[PDB]
Amino acid sequence: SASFWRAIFAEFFATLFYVFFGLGASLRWAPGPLHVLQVALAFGLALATLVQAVGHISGAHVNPAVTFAFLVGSQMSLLRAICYVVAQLLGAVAGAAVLYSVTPPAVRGNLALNTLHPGVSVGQATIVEIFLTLQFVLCIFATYDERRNGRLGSVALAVGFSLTLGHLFGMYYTGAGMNPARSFAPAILTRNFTNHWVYWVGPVIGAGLGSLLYDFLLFP
Amino acid sequence: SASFWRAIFAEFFATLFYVFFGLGASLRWAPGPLHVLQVALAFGLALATLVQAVGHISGAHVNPAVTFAFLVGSQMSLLRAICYVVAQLLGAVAGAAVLYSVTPPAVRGNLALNTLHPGVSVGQATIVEIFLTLQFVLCIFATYDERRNGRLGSVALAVGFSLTLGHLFGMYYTGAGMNPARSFAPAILTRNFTNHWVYWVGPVIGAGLGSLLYDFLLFP
Amino acid sequence: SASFWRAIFAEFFATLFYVFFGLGASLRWAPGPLHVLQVALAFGLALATLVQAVGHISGAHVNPAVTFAFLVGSQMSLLRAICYVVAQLLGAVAGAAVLYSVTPPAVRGNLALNTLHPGVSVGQATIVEIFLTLQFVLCIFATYDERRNGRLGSVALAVGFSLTLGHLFGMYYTGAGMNPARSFAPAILTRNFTNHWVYWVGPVIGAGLGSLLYDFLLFP
Amino acid sequence: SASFWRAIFAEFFATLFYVFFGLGASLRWAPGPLHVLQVALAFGLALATLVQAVGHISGAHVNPAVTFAFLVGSQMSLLRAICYVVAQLLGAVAGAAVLYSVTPPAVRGNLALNTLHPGVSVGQATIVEIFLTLQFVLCIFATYDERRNGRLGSVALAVGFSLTLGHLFGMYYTGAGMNPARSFAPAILTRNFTNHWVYWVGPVIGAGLGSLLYDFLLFP
Amino acid sequence: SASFWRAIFAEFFATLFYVFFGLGASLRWAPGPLHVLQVALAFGLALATLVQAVGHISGAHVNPAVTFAFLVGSQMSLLRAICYVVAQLLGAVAGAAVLYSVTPPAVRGNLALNTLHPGVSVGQATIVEIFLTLQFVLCIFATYDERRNGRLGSVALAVGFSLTLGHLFGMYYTGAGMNPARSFAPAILTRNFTNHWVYWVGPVIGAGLGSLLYDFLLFP
Amino acid sequence: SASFWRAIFAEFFATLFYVFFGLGASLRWAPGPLHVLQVALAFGLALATLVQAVGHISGAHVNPAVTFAFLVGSQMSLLRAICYVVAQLLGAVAGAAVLYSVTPPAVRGNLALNTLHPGVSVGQATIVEIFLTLQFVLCIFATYDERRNGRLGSVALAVGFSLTLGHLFGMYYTGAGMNPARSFAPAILTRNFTNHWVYWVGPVIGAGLGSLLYDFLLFP
Amino acid sequence: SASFWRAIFAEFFATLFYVFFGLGASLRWAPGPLHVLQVALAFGLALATLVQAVGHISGAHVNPAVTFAFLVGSQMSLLRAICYVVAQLLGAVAGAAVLYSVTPPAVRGNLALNTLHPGVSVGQATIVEIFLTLQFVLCIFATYDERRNGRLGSVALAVGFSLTLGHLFGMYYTGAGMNPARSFAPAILTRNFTNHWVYWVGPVIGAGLGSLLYDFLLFP
Amino acid sequence: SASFWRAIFAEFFATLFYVFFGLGASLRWAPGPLHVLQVALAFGLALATLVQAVGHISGAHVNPAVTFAFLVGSQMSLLRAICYVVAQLLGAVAGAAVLYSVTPPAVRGNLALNTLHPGVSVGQATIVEIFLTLQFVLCIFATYDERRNGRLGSVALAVGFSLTLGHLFGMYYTGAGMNPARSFAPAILTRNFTNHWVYWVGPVIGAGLGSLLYDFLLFP
Ligand SMILES: CCCCCCCCCCCCC/C=C\[C@@H](O)[C@H](COP(=O)([O-])OCC[N+](C)(C)C)NC(=O)CCCCCCCCCCCCCCC
Ligand SMILES: CCCCCCCCCCCCC/C=C\[C@@H](O)[C@H](COP(=O)([O-])OCC[N+](C)(C)C)NC(=O)CCCCCCCCCCCCCCC
Ligand SMILES: CCCCCCCCCCCCC/C=C\[C@@H](O)[C@H](COP(=O)([O-])OCC[N+](C)(C)C)NC(=O)CCCCCCCCCCCCCCC
Ligand SMILES: CCCCCCCCCCCCC/C=C\[C@@H](O)[C@H](COP(=O)([O-])OCC[N+](C)(C)C)NC(=O)CCCCCCCCCCCCCCC
Ligand SMILES: CCCCCCCCCCCCC/C=C\[C@@H](O)[C@H](COP(=O)([O-])OCC[N+](C)(C)C)NC(=O)CCCCCCCCCCCCCCC
Ligand SMILES: CCCCCCCCCCCCC/C=C\[C@@H](O)[C@H](COP(=O)([O-])OCC[N+](C)(C)C)NC(=O)CCCCCCCCCCCCCCC
């Protein structure tokens, strides 16, 4: 099972770097010009380079929702799916842990914790997180799919830009927590789980809907 | 006709998400730093991920002008063209409806309504909207074309960047309403159709000119 | 000679739109947040969509320097090279003319005229314009080249990003006038040719050096 | 050995332009809106166009760490590795020298010198520089690798975006000196080597770890 | 009645300049950095210089609410109060008329029309306008009062800063229309009276409450 | 005791408006350009107009620390001091209550709650709050003092600018909570008293030190 | 005539410093956040400190228009008026000359030359400059007037804030050239007198109207 | 000599707070929007509140140059002048020491050290520092002077605004180090005395020239 564990470490390392570079760029070094575009591209380019790296071996899910979507899409065994989520959660905490150690406390903040924007209820926040992950999973499933007569497009860049779009929209509502592991890492390290179920229920449903809309309403 | 209706739902869903993520990022959460670059990339990355998703099944037109261009380009029957526009219009309203329900009223604004900039007449606004959609259709037609000895380039990223360019230029004039469905959704939900014909006449002509310049003056 | 004139109109139209969307985004609608990144991507995405459109028929030079480089690179007859430059110059003026007609006079400014930054001498400005066009031509020649065992990369996106890089650097010095036609259009329409030779000598030399460094010091 | 020296000049020229356009965009023409996103894309698009140019002949390492990684990865002889580093260091100094000559002294500053952010110790700065170069080398090694059944993606754009990500994160800590040559050029020309070993130890270790994690823990 | 009419022209001219310089600075020449602080000081310094000019002859009310407050405070006859309001309304329209003639149409906008912010109901907007004018009248009444043993403070600067405070707070809600004449001028010249009663009911009540809280609960 | 209770209502109303206009301007309507200067002037101009209004009757303390300082300075009986603090606390809650009712929930946030900046310990935060209130009380005591041969200066403007200075410095550390009532109002209405003792211990000590440094080390 | 020449040197020195600190702050060190508020306060605080310095001896006119207004107001002999204008013009050139020598050429620009904004005709620019100087002279005449029963207000701060208001409004139109000497200094040192008569005709008329409106329609 | 030492402690404490609040606001918490206006008002309002506090007892010099000017102006004995400078220097170090202890190391930076801007030579920097302190001393001497028939103006606000003007202009050149004590405090605590003589020679000469221009060329 050498090819199995190498993918688990790939999911561990890539999620570590995804959270490290993702949360790190999200750290408010400045209350100055709008960080939304910078952070959105950071998460996107982070996912783009990691899919380009470990995408051929683990799929570069780096997201319990994404792993949940392939589990729903019947493209991964239950066991491997639990293995990825643990590796993603364990890696996300590690990435935010190293980030906590290298970042000065004045700019660590709440470690880029996904908090609900004022005026955004948990019901509205859940729907936003559903649609954020729905399009994201839809893009992943349509991009990772090998069934098409055409042959064009970069996989890592298309999926990363879908994540960038999710942050260009969702950062104002929920901080764009389209990744339960990315949401779990600052919560576990700051002892703040306020409305944290939104960042699990939302993306998981959005992953399931994106896994279902594609498999039976877009490409049977 | 299973392959027919699946494309209609694809045009419905993708236009829904195109307007949801497009108008949502356009919502002025802040009168702060310039949102033009953020919104332009949002619309572009929104169209990029949707072409990457439903582009193989419906073409990912998500634009009555774009559907009008292929109708002019004789690459789609009249019936299917009317089906797409209804699906696009119905989907755009739905996307802006969900956006209205998840966005707090303080940041909904006019729901990112395409309004004419002061000092920009309806004649100047129409021309801007023509050239915005002309290059956009030109890019789509040159990108969706299968007739070339070369084999390179990502389809979804080229078309999305053409839409981004249109917003990098047209947002100052007309809000860059290169999509009558994207323009119809906030107008129907805010009861504001001021100069709304500009966002239909403009893109439709620009679509026809782009469909004609390509088919008979660029690639006969 | 049907295939000949269709490329001339392609060079005319694309340069028209290159200047229209390029200069238009460069128009200072606001002295607010830094426009450099917005304008740099605008010119780049403008060139990217135009190469994606008319690149298969005229090469999408839209630049007398670029046409000069292929003339130096012996990949185009003298006659066709003069035809392109006239079409580029004539198209650039037309693009800036339409832009002048659709843009309100309060935001037309000097029509995005390439002016030398204070403290930047004409000798320093020439060198900057040389290096701006040198890398730009180097990217074009390496990208348009068909001689390589590998097969990857998007042509239109690589060349457009090279132009974006040139504006990310050169806009502070000379406004990044890496295109004599783009520099000629506002000069002819504003009656301001101050230091205008810099935007011809600079890019032409940079085009020749880029055409020479590639053909005899990079890929013989 | 004609194919050998042509790669050395390629590493010399490309590093010259990498530092010229990289440091030049990093020059604080304005203490205004956040330059991080602009500079990050500048370095990335600079590396993207140079890989697109001289990548087929020298690999477009333009980085002693990257050359060190391939030396560790056993994909380059020791001799050629020393040749590249000298060409990179010599080219970086030349690029910053020309930049010094064309940039007015008021905006040269410290020539974009990689300085440690306050509150960031040399130990934290080293780790940040390790992870910056680790993912960067990981992306390069996974992208330059010819061993995969799939066939998609643009090489120059994936590696440049990895460098952009490194600056989107590392510019706040160390200025994102993921290139000892890019760090050596302003240090040698400003007589300021404060904490300069961090920008050599950091990237070199990060290059070795990225060269090792890929070759024996990701793709044996 | 020479001393009477000279005060009427003073109220006419000063309100003309108050609206001219007030609305003019409020004109969105740029969607860039936050204009709230600039506009708030503009209205304040406008009122400060006008009180310094015509304050000794008409009181420099330049506000139907302020004139209403002194009418409530029994410090002005009914007739003179109607004379001021007509002079203020007539002057405000004239000031916005000259501003319309000297400002290019691209930056006139809606002529700085006091519009209700999204999510701010007419009931909330009325209360904000009450408190804006309440403190403003309180400051005016306490400053114009001659009954105190102390002798210090600049009258024109204290009242202008109270108006500045009202815009520092109220511009986000209602545009800080603490002056029915300032609100009437763009409404009458743009044919837009949407929620215009809020900018009359609000300030008038706030003027009456400020005239009552001072005369019988602060200084009997 | 008519002159007694009228001062209590003055302390109630002015603190209500101080918190209403103070917290309201502090409400993050935009994560855009730096709000520090806007908020600092808002609190200052708020205190300036209120001292200009109710300063002759209650002293316009609107701050339990300021009332504590005069209690320490032996210029106010214990009873009246407790009366003011209750009126200030009761008024502050009322001001933030009305602000909560008129402000949309999307821009209410945490109601401008004084939170400690990351990296600022409670010991450092206390000292900052001491020095913020120390200079503030020093300015108040030196300004309210009637013992000097000179006769110049505006009282309300000098004290308000001292509060502005405190926010120009202290907003980055503790949000500049130089007023326990201003700090108590959002805490009691948001159920968040995290580190709230810092905003009481800090200002009270700073008030006592400022009351002591002036009375026995500056003006005996 | 010792008291005469000391006022001439006062007008020479103060205008020198008015232009030095005024134009210097207007020098675009950064195309970043809006400089209008910074420059407006700079000119205002510059005039405020100079009136506080040399106002008791020369009146601190530092403006040919202001000197023209007192010449119209019959408060100064013709001879002394010509003496001031020469001293102001000579001093303004000297102030901009020293500024030229101490400011690096990269940030000197056009030496803060009053240029007409695009879309602002010379007729509209003249009217703006009239109203800018009209209120400014009105404030000066009402502030320098000794005929009033009241006794309050700071002279230097009221006049400086009137100049600040003029720049808060006029900088977008004409750069707020309310001072022909301030407009003459960069024009004579840059050899650029384009539309320079606007900055003489405008302020002089505005000075005459302000000198007439005050003397015969405001305070006979 | 009780009245003597109380002024020394006043100069010690006020300079401590002047540097504490002055340098603290100058600390770059954010590389965002332009801090020049914020810092300029901070130093000004800091000096304004301190003159309002300890101005009646020590003069609130808080500046070795200002103390040097009164020593030149023959308004203070040599001994008292040395006493003030030691108290100012000792107090400045203490203020920056407390600031160092309360500010997190990530935002301490170089403790707001007055460094020369690139392209500004030590000769140009000296002249700028001369004119910065010259007008500042001129304002102080004209404001502290008791010889005038008029009676108006606030002393503390006029002098603080003169310091604000000096920072509105001088911060771009030298950081506006118009106070050798303010310049000495971060230099002694950061071990960085690069070009530190400029911040002593400059202000001292500017103080002497301002002390001489006033006493013998403005008010004999
Ligand atoms: C909060 C709690 C967190 C707890 C975190 C604990 C993480 C522990 C992770 C343990 C993973 C252990 C994996 C070990 C072996 C597996 O690979 C598994 C064993 O197989 P088997 O049953 O012995 O044989 C069947 C395979 N084959 C090919 C021989 C037929 N699969 C493989 O063979 C693949 C081997 C891949 C080896 C990669 C080794 C990397 C070592 C890096 C060391 C770095 C040290 C750094 C110190 C500072
Ligand atoms: C400031 C001064 C500016 C002056 C600008 C003047 C621009 C004038 C441009 C004139 C170009 C004229 C091109 C005419 C024909 C050429 O294509 C040339 C002729 O060839 P030949 O010698 O007759 O035959 C040998 C070819 N073949 C295939 C038949 C063997 N080549 C071709 O055949 C290719 C034909 C492509 C035709 C494209 C027609 C587009 C028409 C669009 C009209 C739009 C009107 C809009 C009004 C508002
Ligand atoms: C939309 C409709 C808008 C209509 C706007 C119409 C505005 C018309 C304003 C008319 C105001 C007329 C005021 C006329 C005289 C009053 O001063 C009134 C008369 O008094 P009485 O009954 O004759 O005598 C009892 C006074 N006394 C001292 C003699 C005992 N009071 C005075 O005496 C005060 C006189 C102040 C005169 C100021 C004259 C300024 C003239 C400026 C002309 C500018 C022309 C510009 C052309 C381009
Ligand atoms: C969370 C719990 C919050 C509880 C908040 C409760 C706040 C209740 C405040 C009650 C204050 C009551 C003050 C009443 C009278 C005092 O002025 C006190 C009595 O004196 P005495 O012992 O009867 O006579 C000795 C005085 N003299 C001159 C006659 C010799 N002092 C005075 O005389 C001064 C009178 C000042 C009266 C101001 C009346 C304002 C009324 C405004 C009503 C607004 C209603 C709005 C409804 C929507
Ligand atoms: C582009 C061409 C620019 C040309 C610029 C030329 C500027 C030349 C300015 C010359 C002003 C000359 C002023 C000379 C004297 C006047 O004060 C005039 C003479 O009066 P009178 O007729 O001799 O006597 C009747 C007066 N009293 C009291 C004695 C009864 N009035 C006075 O008395 C007031 C005297 C005030 C003297 C101030 C002297 C400052 C000297 C500063 C020197 C600095 C040198 C720096 C070198 C680097
Ligand atoms: C890096 C090296 C830094 C060294 C810093 C050392 C700073 C030391 C400062 C010492 C100042 C000593 C001042 C002592 C007394 C003077 O006031 C001097 C003596 O006069 P004389 O010769 O005894 O009598 C002639 C006066 N009279 C009226 C009685 C006729 N003048 C006075 O009388 C004015 C007295 C004012 C006293 C203010 C006492 C404040 C004490 C605050 C203590 C705070 C402790 C905090 C601990 C944490």
Side-chain angles (χ1 to χ4, degrees), chain A residues 1-6 9 12-13 90, chain D residues 216-217:
Chain A
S1 65
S3 301
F4 177 85
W5 270 120
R6 185 178 65 85
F9 288 107
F12 170 83
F13 279 114
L90 213 79
Chain D
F216 299 98
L217 263 73

Side-chain angles (χ1 to χ4, degrees), chain B residues 33-34 36-37 117 119-120 124 127-128 131-132 134-135 139 142-143 148 151-154 157-158 161-162 164-165 168-169 172-173 213 217-220, chain C residues 6 10 13 16-17 20-21 24-25 27 29-30 33 37-38 41-42 45-46 49 52-54 56-57 98-99 101-104 151 153-155 157 161:
Chain B
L34 202 41
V36 171
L37 168 58
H117 193 279
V120 179
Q124 294 170 329
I127 289 315
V128 166
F131 282 143
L132 287 192
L134 186 151
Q135 58 99 333
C139 188
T143 301
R148 62 187 191 95
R151 187 173 66 256
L152 47 86
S154 178
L157 196 51
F161 277 152
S162 180
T164 301
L165 168 70
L168 284 177
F169 172 85
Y172 295 114
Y173 297 83
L213 180 61
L217 263 73
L218 291 177
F219 284 89
Chain C
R6 185 178 65 85
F13 279 114
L16 189 156
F17 295 118
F20 182 78
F21 295 99
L27 294 190
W29 290 77
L37 168 58
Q38 176 177 135
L41 288 173
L45 296 185
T49 180
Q52 192 69 252
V54 302
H56 282 249
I57 67 192
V98 187
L99 180 69
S101 60
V102 301
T103 304
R151 187 173 66 256
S154 178
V155 164
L157 196 51
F161 277 152

Side-chain angles (χ1 to χ4, degrees), chain H residues 168-194:
Chain H
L168 284 177
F169 172 85
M171 264 182 67
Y172 295 114
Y173 297 83
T174 66
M178 315 154 60
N179 194 327
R182 172 258 174 273
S183 325
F184 181 80
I188 197 61
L189 294 179
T190 325
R191 285 191 303 245
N192 194 5
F193 289 90
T194 299

Side-chain angles (χ1 to χ4, degrees), chain H:
Chain H
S1 65
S3 301
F4 177 85
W5 270 120
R6 185 178 65 85
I8 310 301
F9 288 107
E11 284 295 325
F12 170 83
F13 279 114
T15 304
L16 189 156
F17 295 118
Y18 174 81
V19 163
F20 182 78
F21 295 99
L23 291 209
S26 312
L27 294 190
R28 292 181 177 177
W29 290 77
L34 202 41
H35 51 76
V36 171
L37 168 58
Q38 176 177 135
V39 174
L41 288 173
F43 272 106
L45 296 185
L47 181 58
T49 180
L50 291 163
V51 171
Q52 192 69 252
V54 302
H56 282 249
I57 67 192
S58 58
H61 296 184
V62 303
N63 191 336
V66 170
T67 297
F68 175 86
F70 287 99
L71 184 58
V72 166
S74 179
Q75 290 192 343
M76 179 173 23
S77 61
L78 175 58
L79 175 60
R80 193 186 307 267
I82 325 161
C83 299
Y84 277 2
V85 175
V86 180
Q88 289 152 0
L89 290 177
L90 213 79
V93 176
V98 187
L99 180 69
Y100 186 96
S101 60
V102 301
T103 304
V107 285
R108 287 194 306 230
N110 56 343
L111 213 53
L113 177 73
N114 282 133
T115 166
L116 264 61
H117 193 279
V120 179
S121 65
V122 296
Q124 294 170 329
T126 308
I127 289 315
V128 166
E129 285 291 343
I130 279 139
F131 282 143
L132 287 192
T133 313
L134 186 151
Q135 58 99 333
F136 182 62
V137 163
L138 274 190
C139 188
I140 288 181
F141 275 48
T143 301
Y144 286 1
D145 185 80
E146 306 284 342
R147 294 180 175 180
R148 62 187 191 95
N149 295 329
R151 187 173 66 256
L152 47 86
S154 178
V155 164
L157 196 51
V159 156
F161 277 152
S162 180
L163 189 68
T164 301
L165 168 70
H167 286 69
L168 284 177
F169 172 85
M171 264 182 67
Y172 295 114
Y173 297 83
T174 66
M178 315 154 60
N179 194 327
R182 172 258 174 273
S183 325
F184 181 80
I188 197 61
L189 294 179
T190 325
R191 285 191 303 245
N192 194 5
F193 289 90
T194 299
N195 314 155
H196 186 67
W197 59 269
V198 180
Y199 300 99
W200 277 89
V201 170
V204 157
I205 294 177
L209 307 188
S211 181
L212 274 181
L213 180 61
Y214 182 81
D215 288 338
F216 299 98
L217 263 73
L218 291 177
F219 284 89

Side-chain angles (χ1 to χ4, degrees), chain D residues 12-13 15 21 46 54 70 72 101 106-107 110 115 120 128-129 136 150 154 158 179 201 220:
Chain D
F12 170 83
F13 279 114
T15 304
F21 295 99
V54 302
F70 287 99
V72 166
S101 60
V107 285
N110 56 343
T115 166
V120 179
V128 166
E129 285 291 343
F136 182 62
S154 178
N179 194 327
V201 170

Side-chain angles (χ1 to χ4, degrees), chain G residues 62-149:
Chain G
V62 303
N63 191 336
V66 170
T67 297
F68 175 86
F70 287 99
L71 184 58
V72 166
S74 179
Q75 290 192 343
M76 179 173 23
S77 61
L78 175 58
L79 175 60
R80 193 186 307 267
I82 325 161
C83 299
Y84 277 2
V85 175
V86 180
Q88 289 152 0
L89 290 177
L90 213 79
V93 176
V98 187
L99 180 69
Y100 186 96
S101 60
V102 301
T103 304
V107 285
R108 287 194 306 230
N110 56 343
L111 213 53
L113 177 73
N114 282 133
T115 166
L116 264 61
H117 193 279
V120 179
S121 65
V122 296
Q124 294 170 329
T126 308
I127 289 315
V128 166
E129 285 291 343
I130 279 139
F131 282 143
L132 287 192
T133 313
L134 186 151
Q135 58 99 333
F136 182 62
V137 163
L138 274 190
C139 188
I140 288 181
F141 275 48
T143 301
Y144 286 1
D145 185 80
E146 306 284 342
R147 294 180 175 180
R148 62 187 191 95
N149 295 329

